[PDB]
Amino acid sequence: TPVRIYTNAEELVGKPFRDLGEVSGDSCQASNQDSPPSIPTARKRMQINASKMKANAVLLHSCEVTSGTPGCYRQAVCIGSALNIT
């Protein structure tokens, strides 16, 4: 994951790329008793998911800490577009 994370589409102005598709990374706090959700781990896992598509970069759209998730008391999730900047 020498997958560069961009956080703003403005940063992409003037760099043609291929959108390889959407990626997600999450961190699950299963229980109350466990460590809280890890924002860094959510982001890293997204990045690794992009890397598996042979991405160069990811445009991070958003992250969020949620209470709703099926397996998790709390969850951090980050989402983005895996990209090949050519």
PDB file of C-alpha atoms in Angstrom:
ATOM      1  CA  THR A   1       0.000   0.000   0.000  1.00  0.00           C
ATOM      2  CA  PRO A   2       2.262   2.708  -1.490  1.00  0.00           C
ATOM      3  CA  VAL A   3      -1.312   3.586  -2.459  1.00  0.00           C
ATOM      4  CA  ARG A   4      -1.528   7.296  -2.128  1.00  0.00           C
ATOM      5  CA  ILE A   5      -4.618   8.524  -0.385  1.00  0.00           C
ATOM      6  CA  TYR A   6      -6.190  11.628  -1.892  1.00  0.00           C
ATOM      7  CA  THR A   7      -8.972  13.276   0.107  1.00  0.00           C
ATOM      8  CA  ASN A   8     -10.277  15.808  -2.334  1.00  0.00           C
ATOM      9  CA  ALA A   9     -11.118  15.591  -6.011  1.00  0.00           C
ATOM     10  CA  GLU A  10      -9.425  18.982  -6.448  1.00  0.00           C
ATOM     11  CA  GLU A  11      -6.143  17.228  -5.898  1.00  0.00           C
ATOM     12  CA  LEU A  12      -6.896  15.150  -9.025  1.00  0.00           C
ATOM     13  CA  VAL A  13      -7.529  18.048 -11.363  1.00  0.00           C
ATOM     14  CA  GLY A  14      -5.313  17.505 -14.334  1.00  0.00           C
ATOM     15  CA  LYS A  15      -4.231  13.942 -13.567  1.00  0.00           C
ATOM     16  CA  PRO A  16      -6.019  11.456 -15.902  1.00  0.00           C
ATOM     17  CA  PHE A  17      -6.649   8.089 -14.188  1.00  0.00           C
ATOM     18  CA  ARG A  18      -8.566   4.920 -14.379  1.00  0.00           C
ATOM     19  CA  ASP A  19     -11.260   4.322 -11.882  1.00  0.00           C
ATOM     20  CA  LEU A  20     -10.827   0.722 -10.892  1.00  0.00           C
ATOM     21  CA  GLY A  21     -13.885   0.744  -8.630  1.00  0.00           C
ATOM     22  CA  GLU A  22     -15.094   1.350  -5.055  1.00  0.00           C
ATOM     23  CA  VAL A  23     -13.275   0.098  -1.980  1.00  0.00           C
ATOM     24  CA  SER A  24     -14.100   0.067   1.750  1.00  0.00           C
ATOM     25  CA  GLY A  25     -12.185  -0.491   4.973  1.00  0.00           C
ATOM     26  CA  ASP A  26     -13.639  -0.937   8.412  1.00  0.00           C
ATOM     27  CA  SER A  27     -12.785  -1.273  12.126  1.00  0.00           C
ATOM     28  CA  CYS A  28     -15.370  -3.090  14.347  1.00  0.00           C
ATOM     29  CA  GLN A  29     -15.757  -2.604  18.074  1.00  0.00           C
ATOM     30  CA  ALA A  30     -17.753  -5.770  18.755  1.00  0.00           C
ATOM     31  CA  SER A  31     -18.446  -5.016  22.326  1.00  0.00           C
ATOM     32  CA  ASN A  32     -18.512  -2.172  24.827  1.00  0.00           C
ATOM     33  CA  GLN A  33     -15.710  -3.892  26.526  1.00  0.00           C
ATOM     34  CA  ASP A  34     -13.404  -3.734  23.516  1.00  0.00           C
ATOM     35  CA  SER A  35     -11.212  -0.936  22.204  1.00  0.00           C
ATOM     36  CA  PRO A  36     -13.105   1.696  20.318  1.00  0.00           C
ATOM     37  CA  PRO A  37     -13.206   1.593  16.484  1.00  0.00           C
ATOM     38  CA  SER A  38      -9.872   2.420  14.836  1.00  0.00           C
ATOM     39  CA  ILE A  39     -10.116   5.190  12.215  1.00  0.00           C
ATOM     40  CA  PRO A  40      -6.593   4.523  11.102  1.00  0.00           C
ATOM     41  CA  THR A  41      -7.266   0.800  10.645  1.00  0.00           C
ATOM     42  CA  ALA A  42     -10.464   1.592   8.619  1.00  0.00           C
ATOM     43  CA  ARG A  43      -8.397   3.756   6.323  1.00  0.00           C
ATOM     44  CA  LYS A  44      -5.542   1.338   6.014  1.00  0.00           C
ATOM     45  CA  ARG A  45      -7.842  -1.526   5.172  1.00  0.00           C
ATOM     46  CA  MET A  46      -9.489   0.557   2.407  1.00  0.00           C
ATOM     47  CA  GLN A  47      -6.045   1.300   1.099  1.00  0.00           C
ATOM     48  CA  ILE A  48      -5.061  -2.386   1.106  1.00  0.00           C
ATOM     49  CA  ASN A  49      -8.317  -3.202  -0.654  1.00  0.00           C
ATOM     50  CA  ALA A  50      -7.313  -0.660  -3.355  1.00  0.00           C
ATOM     51  CA  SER A  51      -3.860  -2.210  -3.474  1.00  0.00           C
ATOM     52  CA  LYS A  52      -5.396  -5.593  -4.196  1.00  0.00           C
ATOM     53  CA  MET A  53      -6.932  -4.082  -7.377  1.00  0.00           C
ATOM     54  CA  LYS A  54      -3.486  -2.885  -8.357  1.00  0.00           C
ATOM     55  CA  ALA A  55      -4.452   0.667  -7.551  1.00  0.00           C
ATOM     56  CA  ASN A  56      -1.904   3.476  -7.482  1.00  0.00           C
ATOM     57  CA  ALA A  57      -4.075   5.740  -5.355  1.00  0.00           C
ATOM     58  CA  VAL A  58      -7.460   6.017  -3.642  1.00  0.00           C
ATOM     59  CA  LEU A  59      -9.815   8.964  -3.471  1.00  0.00           C
ATOM     60  CA  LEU A  60     -11.292   8.831  -0.042  1.00  0.00           C
ATOM     61  CA  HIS A  61     -14.904   9.934  -0.220  1.00  0.00           C
ATOM     62  CA  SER A  62     -15.797   9.693   3.370  1.00  0.00           C
ATOM     63  CA  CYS A  63     -15.501   7.987   6.718  1.00  0.00           C
ATOM     64  CA  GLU A  64     -17.980   7.588   9.474  1.00  0.00           C
ATOM     65  CA  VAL A  65     -18.292   6.148  12.990  1.00  0.00           C
ATOM     66  CA  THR A  66     -21.587   4.265  13.205  1.00  0.00           C
ATOM     67  CA  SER A  67     -23.594   2.548  15.947  1.00  0.00           C
ATOM     68  CA  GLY A  68     -25.956   0.610  13.613  1.00  0.00           C
ATOM     69  CA  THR A  69     -23.684  -2.161  12.092  1.00  0.00           C
ATOM     70  CA  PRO A  70     -24.695  -5.828  12.327  1.00  0.00           C
ATOM     71  CA  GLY A  71     -21.563  -7.099  14.008  1.00  0.00           C
ATOM     72  CA  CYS A  72     -20.478  -4.096  15.967  1.00  0.00           C
ATOM     73  CA  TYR A  73     -21.326  -2.008  18.942  1.00  0.00           C
ATOM     74  CA  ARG A  74     -19.441   0.678  17.025  1.00  0.00           C
ATOM     75  CA  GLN A  75     -17.791   0.632  13.592  1.00  0.00           C
ATOM     76  CA  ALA A  76     -15.481   2.991  11.723  1.00  0.00           C
ATOM     77  CA  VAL A  77     -15.779   2.660   7.933  1.00  0.00           C
ATOM     78  CA  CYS A  78     -13.969   4.613   5.203  1.00  0.00           C
ATOM     79  CA  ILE A  79     -14.941   4.499   1.530  1.00  0.00           C
ATOM     80  CA  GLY A  80     -13.225   5.536  -1.668  1.00  0.00           C
ATOM     81  CA  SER A  81     -12.376   4.996  -5.353  1.00  0.00           C
ATOM     82  CA  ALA A  82      -9.423   2.845  -6.130  1.00  0.00           C
ATOM     83  CA  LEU A  83      -7.489   4.481  -8.926  1.00  0.00           C
ATOM     84  CA  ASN A  84      -4.608   4.065 -11.348  1.00  0.00           C
ATOM     85  CA  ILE A  85      -3.071   7.423 -11.951  1.00  0.00           C
ATOM     86  CA  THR A  86      -1.106   6.850 -15.178  1.00  0.00           C
TER      87      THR A  86
END
